[PDB]
């Protein structure tokens, strides 16, 4: 996580942040595992920076990607 935080602060200007690779990160179910931990910090990674969330033109639609 601290290489790809520092790897995105340092490159802000040629990286399209990818989603629909984070969302399969936390669009998980079965509360009984810690597998949206690693969507929820790269997403927090990417937010730590002015880097906006989800990027309309990428995917998903914004409805179901915050939902």
Do not use: H
């Not at 290489?3 to 200007?13: A, F, G, Q, R, S």
């Not at 989603?19 to 990160?25: M, S």
């Not at 949206?36 to 880097?51: E, H, R, Y």
């Amino acid at each position: 996580l601290e290489i790809i935080k520092t790897l995105v602060e340092c490159w802000k200007d040629c990286l399209s942040i990818p989603y629909r690779l984070i969302f399969e990160k936390f669009s998980g179910k079965d509360p009984n595992s810690k597998d949206n931990s690693v969507g929820i910090q790269l997403l927090g990674i990417v937010m730590a920076n002015d880097l906006p969330p989800y990027d309309p033109q990428c995917g998903i639609q914004s409805s179901e990607y915050f939902q």
